[PDB]
Design a protein around this ligand. Structure first.
Ligand SMILES: CN(C)c1ccc(C(=O)NCCCCCCC(=O)NO)cc1
Ligand SMILES: [K+]
Ligand SMILES: [K+]
Ligand SMILES: [Zn+2]
Length: 349
């Protein structure tokens, strides 16, 4: 039975210092309104210790972050932000611990996925890279970890953490366009040194929809699985790809993301599920509730059930999201060229 990382205090903490308010409450409240929590093993998250956070971040960065939370320019830098970051990092580590111990094959921290943070630098509103911390916890048991990042943005912090190693392969599908954050992650970015070809990047343009996205994702993950043979997976599912997000870049629905998730779940590997960037509150809850249903194999009712935040689901009050009427800017020949480039990189793996 999947593990669901959750406590009322954790959700309150996540919404107190969140970049987007009440997002954690709405996601959990919708999952609860669909009664999906009854089909999962609810595990209270522990708070990450200083030593656990220092598995990736430097002592100087963690000490400075802890002080200002009580030369910030140097570390890419709010009251209480350190306890917030330690709570989210501890939640992802707790999920990874559940996977190590064989408590489950899928463990979910929807409030995690803060993929931009570097060892000594906050970045992209990420003060602590819980995805890296979770991978490093999984490295206690699993020899090869696959990190898949389906956020709108390039998972640069996670890729940079493992750029020099072949024990962790990072795969990011993201918007890539001059001026678009964080600006890295071209298909030519393949890692460095012993990690060369163990970073995979799929640059994508505005307006992609469910069918073409899944064709790209399935093609990449199929070749990655055969070449890399991962023993565990960490999957980042930032909902800022979803139609109606203020980012207004991709044109996805949770159904397309869900097919990517299903393809990974079929591998039967230990799988750590994370959230990520997401800026439409109601659509974020829609997406991650639906994806929770996919994890559980359950079909959900279309009408948003009556619950605390029902009035936020206008004007339609249904779970389904409709794509926006705007163009797909992705040229099929550019996409194929990217797929050819990646296939050639993975022959080296
Ligand atoms: C209030 N408002 C509309 C905004 C405030 C800040 C930014 C921004 O700094 N953007 C640059 C940093 C982008 C970080 C993206 C985080 C993300 O989703 N990563 O996956 C933009 C808009
Ligand atoms: K991504
Ligand atoms: K790597
Ligand atoms: Zn994002």
């Amino acid at each position: 039975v999947p593990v669901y990382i959750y406590s009322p205090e954790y959700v309150s903490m996540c919404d107190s210092l969140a970049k987007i308010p009440k997002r954690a409450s709405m996601v959990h409240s919708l999952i609860e309104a669909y009664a999906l929590h009854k089909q999962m093993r609810i595990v209270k998250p522990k708070v990450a210790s200083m030593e656990e956070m220092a598995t990736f971040h430097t002592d100087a960065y963690l000490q400075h972050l802890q002080k200002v939370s009580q030369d910030s320019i140097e570390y890419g830098l709010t009251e209480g932000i350190f306890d917030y970051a330690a709570a989210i990092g501890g939640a992802t580590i707790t999920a990874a611990q559940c996977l190590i111990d064989g408590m489950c094959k899928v463990a979910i921290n929807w409030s995690g996925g803060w993929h931009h943070a570097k060892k000594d630098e906050a970045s992209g509103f990420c003060y602590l890279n819980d995805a890296v911390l979770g991978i490093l916890r999984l490295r206690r048991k699993f020899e090869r970890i696959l990190y898949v990042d389906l956020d709108l943005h390039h998972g640069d912090g996670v890729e940079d953490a493992f750029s020099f190693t072949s024990k962790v392969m990072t795969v990011s599908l993201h918007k890539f366009s001059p001026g678009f954050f964080p600006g890295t992650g071209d298909v030519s970015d393949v890692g460095l040194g012993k990690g060369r070809y163990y970073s995979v990047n799929v640059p994508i343009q505005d307006g992609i929809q469910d069918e073409k996205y899944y064709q790209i994702c399935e093609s990449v993950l199929k070749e990655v699985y055969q070449a890399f043979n991962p023993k565990a997976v960490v999957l980042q599912l930032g909902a800022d790809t979803i139609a109606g997000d203020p980012m207004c870049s991709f044109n996805m629905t949770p159904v397309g993301i869900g097919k990517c998730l299903k393809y990974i779940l079929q591998w039967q590997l230990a799988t750590l599920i994370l959230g990520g960037g997401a800026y439409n509150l109601a659509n974020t809850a829609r997406c991650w509730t639906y994806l929770t249903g996919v994890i559980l194999g359950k079909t959900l009712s279309s009408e948003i059930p009556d619950h605390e935040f029902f009035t936020a689901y206008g004007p339609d009050y249904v779970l389904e999201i409709t794509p926006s009427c705007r163009p797909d800017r992705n040229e099929p020949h550019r996409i194929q060229q990217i797929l050819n480039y990646i296939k050639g990189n993975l022959k080296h793996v």
